[PDB]
């Protein structure tokens, strides 16, 4: 009963922003450590950043700083990942995964 629902596939022209959503990860008092992973058919898996609901902390990768913006809505909800100037290298499958309660390595619950 622990599954994560996202926004859905989207076809975007170059130079426009897109906003991805996650669900059922990020509640009051609990406390998850949400991560986002990019999957390009050539580069495999790439870690984007780690966001902590409740506290709302934010950590990024220098490759994606300025490209990916992370937000968290403490009620319900979350975790919104938005990308700005979209180029051909952003065509990928994005995942919202959360290890149970905290930390980085563990992704047993994927979007």
């Amino acid at each position: 009963e622990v599954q994560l629902q996202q926004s859905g596939a989207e076809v975007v022209r170059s130079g426009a922003s897109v906003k991805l959503s996650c669900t059922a990860s990020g509640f009051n008092i609990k406390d998850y450590a949400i991560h986002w992973v990019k999957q390009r058919p050539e580069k495999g898996l790439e870690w984007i950043g780690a966001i902590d609901p409740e506290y709302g902390d934010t950590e990024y990768v220098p490759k994606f700083q300025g490209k990916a913006t992370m937000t968290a809505d403490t009620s319900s909800n979350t975790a919104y990942l938005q990308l700005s100037s979209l180029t051909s290298e952003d065509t990928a499958v994005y995942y919202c995964n959360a290890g149970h309660d905290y930390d980085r390595g563990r992704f047993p619950y994927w979007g």
Partner: protein, 416 residues
Amino acid sequence: KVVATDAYVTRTNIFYHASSSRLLAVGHPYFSIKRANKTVVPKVSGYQYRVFKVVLPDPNKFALPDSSLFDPTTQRLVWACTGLEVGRGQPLGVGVSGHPFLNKYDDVENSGSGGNPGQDNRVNVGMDYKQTQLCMVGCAPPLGEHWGKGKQCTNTPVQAGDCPPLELITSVIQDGDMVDTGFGAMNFADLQTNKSDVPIDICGTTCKYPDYLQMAADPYGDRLFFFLRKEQMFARHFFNRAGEVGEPVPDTLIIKGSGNRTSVGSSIYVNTPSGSLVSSEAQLFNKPYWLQKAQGHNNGICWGNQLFVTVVDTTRSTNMTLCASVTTSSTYTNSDYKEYMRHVEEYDLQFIFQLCSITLSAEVVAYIHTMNPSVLEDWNFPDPYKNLSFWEVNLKEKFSSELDQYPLGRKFLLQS
């Protein structure tokens, strides 16, 4: 509705002395030793309750000097406790408990430490417990209170890994139950599932604390003829627990940082206790106590010809270290020796009772049918405590009318 025993129990001039002789308990201060099925070495620790079930001879069946004291009909006899001395016969000292995998993360008293949360951060840590002295007397076993995994659940409905509901459970203190240490009176077997938050001698059992309020609020007061207590402790060291914080610090209370840091440190703090100094001036034992007046209505009447004496003494908790040689190499090698833990307890229970008669009128028999009805059944006018565990002290064939032939008897003649 409830009246004191002084109204319907007449006192006599017949006094008796009874001594349990030397009582010795030798075992392991941390856990029982079972090979291969049943225990071979018992668990003997200074932080255990010593609940002595003293069995008294029936005065209605006793070989009294003269039977003209009472009429076999309409009158019955019962013993009344008037003197008590719990003698301890071991050197004063403090014993230590520990855990080779105690859930201690960082020494939080001073400072540190950056960021090392990992698989297993348990450390081998030892400590001394809080000093506790107490002794009680009654004709019924004492009541202890402890916090356990409460009935589920207040509010509803879901698991898992959440905080267990707490419930204050009152129970009977059995011989061998653990007294509170520095981490409270709780059922560590149920509330701490990692078997690593407290030292090994309490991590799989339950620490019980006496419910003085309930036992004092009892109508008849059969459990507290009197009590004496002395508890003392201070905070030795501070540290935090490893693992995920089940209830995080609220946002409103911390300004998030920090470039680095960013992960909130473990905010589950617990401190090690310490019993501080033990001294002879602080001793409650090795001195007689005379039950001049009882707090309850039962003024020391031992109904059922039995007496429950509870004793806690952590001032003689010294754990002896034994070293046996398996071999003797040319040089010193640790593999040649085995180290063992052993603890001892020496007791000498001394009592002085007063014979009393009860004129059984219609009103008296009615008042005694209510309360304990077995008092009338045993008088000819199954034991629910066989499921519990007490230190049996058979004082039948130990009563003596020659008071001056014993230390407590000599002290009784020159006092009270």
